């Protein structure tokens, strides 16, 4: 746009870290998440990485190495069909579920799962997972929110309440869970319990089917097609935790085609890069092409 960058500009230009350019990593908060008390040496601070894409929820338990970060366990919301949840796969209730699953999943493969059960009751209470006096301290993790905005009622703190209630000691506070009254400076565990069981989505389904038959039958086209009634929602989630705690361990998907096979097909849509020889050839052509006052 005739704002052409000089060479002066280009040359003295110092680039950000790659993932900074990409708008993915916030290195100022990564430092403070990753860094260990130097007198705790090689003991890893573990991160509860929670991420939301438009259609999925990603949950990872990660630690860092010079040669790269390292994931202990991961759970996804796209796993939840297996545990009986097939809709609203990025809503609040989906968080608490995937947050639960990652919890139960890690300290399963840690042996911590037989001790430290979590809550099982689940009534939206603010509480941490206190340590079994006179034995192993609970597996401790810290919430990596990434670039998510700390708003009070944010999906990302769903996965927090699911991961705390899952037995993982994950240090946190009330004031960002749904149902915190900044005037009351107090939490209503009702609203929070509700949100854990998709209570805010159910109410809406009713509101809609009652007041807008056409719209509801579109936003929730998929519920009609499965005979899922609104008020049956809570049971889906309830029986899901159930199913989750019951078999938290991870089964991978079965896959068609070999790991290698995909490759041999995939990017044969890979535009192949030229060799210097035909490159020069290319231009020695291009010259004659333009070599004339037009």
């Amino acid at each position: 746009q005739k704002d052409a960058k000089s060479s002066a500009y280009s040359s003295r230009f110092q680039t950000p870290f790659r993932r900074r350019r990409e708008g993915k990593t916030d290195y100022y908060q990564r430092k403070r998440l990753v860094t260990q008390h130097k007198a705790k040496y090689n003991t890893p601070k573990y991160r509860l990485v929670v991420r939301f894409t438009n259609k999925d929820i990603i949950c990872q338990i990660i630690s860092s190495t010079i040669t790269g970060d390292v994931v202990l366990a991961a759970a996804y919301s796209h796993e939840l069909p297996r545990y009986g949840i097939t809709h609203g796969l990025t809503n609040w209730a989906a968080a608490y579920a995937t947050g639960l699953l990652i919890a139960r999943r890690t300290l399963q493969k840690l042996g911590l799962d037989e001790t430290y059960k979590g809550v099982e009751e689940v009534e939206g209470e603010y509480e941490l997972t206190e340590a079994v006096e006179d034995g192993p301290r609970p597996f401790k993790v810290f919430l990596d929110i990434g670039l998510q905005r700390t708003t009070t009622g944010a999906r990302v703190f769903g996965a927090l309440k699911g991961a705390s209630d899952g037995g993982l000691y994950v240090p946190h506070s009330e004031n960002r869970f749904p149902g915190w009254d900044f005037e009351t400076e107090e939490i209503d565990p009702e609203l929070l319990r509700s949100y854990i069981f998709g209570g805010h989505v159910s109410q809406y389904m009713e509101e809609l089917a009652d007041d807008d038959e056409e719209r509801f039958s579109e936003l929730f086209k998929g519920y009609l097609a499965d005979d899922i009634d609104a008020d049956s929602l809570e049971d889906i989630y309830t029986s899901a935790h159930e199913a989750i705690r019951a078999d938290p361990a991870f089964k991978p998907t079965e896959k068609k085609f070999t790991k290698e096979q995909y490759a041999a097909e995939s990017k044969k849509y890979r535009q192949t890069k030229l060799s210097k020889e035909e490159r020069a050839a290319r231009v020695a052509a291009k010259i004659a092409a333009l070599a004339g006052q037009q």
């Binding site: 110092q14 870290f17 130097k38 007198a39 190495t65 010079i66």
Partner: protein, 159 residues
């Protein structure tokens, strides 16, 4: 009046490298430091806390302490006619494991092993370094190589 402040004379010493300003990467915080470790010192001027004084720039010492965000390094400082012993508290951003120390340990392992294999044949070793010896005889061949013979070149200006 003369001026001898704490960071005097360090306009270039505590300067960042060209096109290497801003955020210090995370390798620097992931490195682990034990007592007895040998570290180089090289201040990062963006980390104003726990800087070495400018003297200790480029000096190398031993860890005597590992605290939360820092190490204590022991530096032997010459003052007068005797070496004095200095306790330094540096944040990790101003410290670096010494390579030549890491090579030494590799050679210690290497030396143990060469010693194993040798003794596991009762044979001799020579485990210690010898310096660059002279040169044994050679026979250069002249095939493909009949000595191009050079000579000095005349003077010649060209402006």
């Amino acid at each position: 009046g003369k001026s001898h402040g704490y960071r005097s004379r360090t306009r270039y010493m505590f300067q960042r490298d060209f096109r290497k300003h801003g955020a210090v990467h995370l390798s620097t915080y992931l490195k682990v430091y034990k007592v007895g470790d040998i570290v180089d010192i090289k201040a990062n001027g963006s980390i104003q806390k726990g800087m070495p004084h400018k003297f200790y720039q480029g000096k190398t010492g031993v860890v005597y302490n590992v605290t939360k965000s820092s190490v204590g390094v022991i530096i032997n400082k010459m003052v007068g006619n005797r070496y004095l012993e200095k306790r330094l508290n540096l944040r990790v951003e101003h410290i670096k494991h010494s390579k030549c120390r890491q090579e030494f340990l590799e050679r210690v392992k290497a030396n143990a092993a060469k010693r194993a294999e040798a003794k596991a044949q009762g044979v001799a070793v020579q485990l210690k370094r010898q310096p660059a010896q002279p040169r044994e005889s050679r026979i250069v061949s002249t095939e493909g190589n009949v000595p191009q013979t050079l000579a000095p070149v005349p003077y010649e200006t060209f402006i």
